[PDB]
Amino acid sequence: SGAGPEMVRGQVFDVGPRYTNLSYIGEGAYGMVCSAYDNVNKVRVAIKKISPFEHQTYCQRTLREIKILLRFRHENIIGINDIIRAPTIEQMKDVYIVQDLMETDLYKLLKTQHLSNDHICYFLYQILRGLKYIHSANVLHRDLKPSNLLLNTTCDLKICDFGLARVADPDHDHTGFLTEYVATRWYRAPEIMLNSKGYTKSIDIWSVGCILAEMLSNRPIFPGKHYLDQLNHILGILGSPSQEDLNCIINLKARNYLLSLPHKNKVPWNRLFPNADSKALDLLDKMLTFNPHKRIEVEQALAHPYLEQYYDPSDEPIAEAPFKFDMELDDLPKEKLKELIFEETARFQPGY
Ligand SMILES: CC[C@H](C)Cc1nnc2cc(-c3ccnc(Nc4ccnn4C)n3)ccn12
């Protein structure tokens, strides 16, 4: 057994001596997740190494995920057990977020399993149960997809990866102030392309719609081959937008773009999903609604007939202290965000 830090696929995981036996789970552009063993609590954990400090955007995404998840406690949202980083800011090159280990994710499960309607129904209920809490906190997740839905054999489901999440205080108009090119391509609402700085939390409902379609068929519904291809896939099934929906698009340049497209008819849902529950296809239609204002909201989605076996507002917590603009003060130099990340994580340090 080496004395130095363990290393997974070339990435040092300086998490010893409490956390050992690291195993690769997955990775992103500036981070890697491994499973590990907590020798102090005698439990299996997942550890998310983030290395963001060279770029302001990565620092913003690290700070947000930490601040939001530390302030969240909900059965359908992954919690933070512990955060590891260096004792001084000059030494801190990485941050390690420790979470309870989940057995798999929905992306992996769908590679090997055709889900029963009951499993689809229960997974969908739980996604929306957690989303209800998220939206009640004035948070947008902005990256819901199968690989961010964690699953246990008991069918417990937890949403993870809040790196793309952010607060939008509804006392302020965020139109024109939101980041473009959010979400993962196949799961992007049309307005992320057509209203790239002025979308709302209804993009999360669009993503959930895409996830439901994927549970129904084990394949992505809108597998765009590149950024501009994505809208074409969406319209290829929804059909060309109605004049009404078109005339709701405030960005003239985007409206003219849509007028310039050849007309596509709508593909009926039961043609794509001929074996699906009719109730499930109705909720899918409401979630994959082109117009973001007519698109169903999370509470109405929970109240939909498809989910009536589970819908229970008395057992569906919401945020007791919804987030406000103080959680949005991060348009700052990456050197200053590094200080804020150091301060948010000090509560896990010896001393403090
Ligand atoms: C580098 C960031 C990455 C791309 C996205 C991301 N961000 N936060 C998380 C948290 C987990 C996680 C947590 C707990 N348990 C498992 N378990 C699991 C999932 C699949 N297999 N296994 C064993 N994962 C996973 C991914 N995550």
Author numbering: 5 to 356
Task: Provide passages from the article that reported this PDB entry.
By contrast, ERK2 is unusual in that only small conformational changes occur within the active site between the inactive, unphosphorylated (0P) and the active, dual phosphorylated (2P) forms of the kinase. X-ray structures show that dual phosphorylation of ERK2 at T183 and Y185 remodels the activation loop by forming phosphate salt bridges with several Arg residues.
Structures of 2P-ERK2 complexed with inhibitors #8 and #16 were solved and compared to previous structures of 2P-ERK2 complexed with VTX11e and GDC0994. Both inhibitors #8 and #16 formed contacts with active site residues that matched those contacting VTX11e and GDC0994. Both contacted the backbone of strand β1 at angles that allowed but were unlikely to force Gly loop closure. In contrast, the two nitrogens in the triazole ring of inhibitors #8 and #16 formed separate hydrogen bonds to K52 and W1, respectively. This separation had the effect of shifting the K52-E69 salt bridge position relative to GDC0994. As a result, the Gly loop shifts to a more closed state, allowing the pocket below the Gly loop to accommodate two water molecules that form OH-π interactions with Y34, and favoring outward movement of helicesαC and αL16.
